[PDB]
Amino acid sequence: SWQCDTCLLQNKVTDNKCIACQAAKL
Amino acid sequence: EPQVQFKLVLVGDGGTGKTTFVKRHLTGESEKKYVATLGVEVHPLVFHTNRGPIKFNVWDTAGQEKFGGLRDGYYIQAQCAIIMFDVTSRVTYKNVPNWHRDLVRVCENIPIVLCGNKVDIKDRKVKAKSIVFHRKKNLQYYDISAKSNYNFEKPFLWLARKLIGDPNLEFVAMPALAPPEVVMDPALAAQYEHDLEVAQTTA
Ligand SMILES: Nc1nc2c(ncn2[C@@H]2O[C@H](COP(=O)(O)OP(=O)(O)O)[C@@H](O)[C@H]2O)c(=O)[nH]1
Ligand SMILES: [Mg+2]
Ligand SMILES: [Zn+2]
């Protein structure tokens, strides 16, 4: 699991963006 | 090596002191981030447990609560929460069930702590005897005083023990906190702590 460097939420590899704020994975 | 962190959502009536509260933690305050698509400052609060470092990622609102309920995007993946009311303000306590509902709806069964902020003020309105919502469920309750740091750590310790499942988890050191801008009388703290016990063993 990677981490979104905008909100710090722990998303999944299958996720390509954030399931909380709709922010792109870098 | 991967880090231990939880999303913690901080909800309750506007004016209850949520922002004042998450901000007592200097490092969290300075490293906090800003989801602009949701109007939310996330505050990384690290606590040092006898088991290691744990990060509560506290989501604090940019005020949107005074004008209605929050969007799912806010509650998403919450893994614990703090509900806050103002002890000088009965209506904030009366809206506590409201928040709890809007929460559970999105976060099926997560640990929650109920908090009575502003205990520093002398003329209190919501005494310990009135605080009853937490009687039900899985709702630990603490008096707190953001501006004096009183019981600041309590809500978090209790949440850490649930998410780890270690009743014997301890914080080795109290995090770096902003100096108490008001004093918390040891008398009030003692009467109020006593008024909490003489309630848990009663009704
Ligand atoms: N006496 C006292 N006042 C507080 C405390 N925490 C917050 N306040 C006051 O409550 C008002 C609103 O606080 P704020 O953090 O902005 O509330 P929020 O809307 O829940 O985020 C401010 O004027 C604060 O100074 C506290 O622990 N004690
Ligand atoms: Mg605020
Ligand atoms: Zn995000």
- Joined together, the tokens standing for residue B147 give 């501006």
Write the CATH number for B191: 3.40.50.300
CA of B45 to the centre of ligand 2 (A): 17
Report the alpha-carbon distance of residue B99 to residue B84 in Å, rounded. 9
The resolution, in angstroms to one decimal, equals 2.7
- Joined together, the tokens standing for residue B104 give 């559970």
CB of residue B17 inside a 6 A radius of ligand 1 = yes
Report yes or no: A8 at the B interface, CB cutoff 8 Å.
yes
Domain that holds residue B154: 1-203
How many CA atoms are closer than 13 Å to the CA of B156, on its beta-carbon side?
A: 27
**Cα–Cα separations (whole angstroms), residue B56 to B32, B158, B184, B191, B197:** 12, 12, 26, 31, 28
CA of B41 to the centre of ligand 2 (A): 9
Domain count, chain B: 1
CB atoms within 10 A of CB B186: 8
3-class secondary structure per residue, B115-138: EEECCCCCCCCCCHHHCCHHHCCC
- Return the closest-CA partner of residue B97 out of B60, B134, B53, B129: B134
